[PDB]
Amino acid sequence: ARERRDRLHEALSVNRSRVNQLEKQIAFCEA
Amino acid sequence: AEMRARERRDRLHEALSVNRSRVNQLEKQIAFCEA
Predict the structure, then answer these.
(1) What SS3 string covers chain B?
(2) Nearest Cα to A28, choosing from B23, B19, B30, B20?
(3) Which residue of A6, B10, B11, B34 has the lowest C-beta tally within 10 Å?
């Protein structure tokens, strides 16, 4: 169980990091 | 102790959400005005 949920956790972290990075770039573009 | 603890933590969660929102809007103000 822990293997699956842990790899899911790290996948979640990567996805959310990508989202934040792209949002920051797009906000810079807007300004 | 359980009730008091959960109450304190819930209040802190709500305050943190408000803090994040405030930071975002003031960040936008700062960037725009500086430019």
Answers:
(1) CHHHHHHHHHHHHHHHHHHHHHHHHHHHHHHHHHC
(2) B30
(3) B34
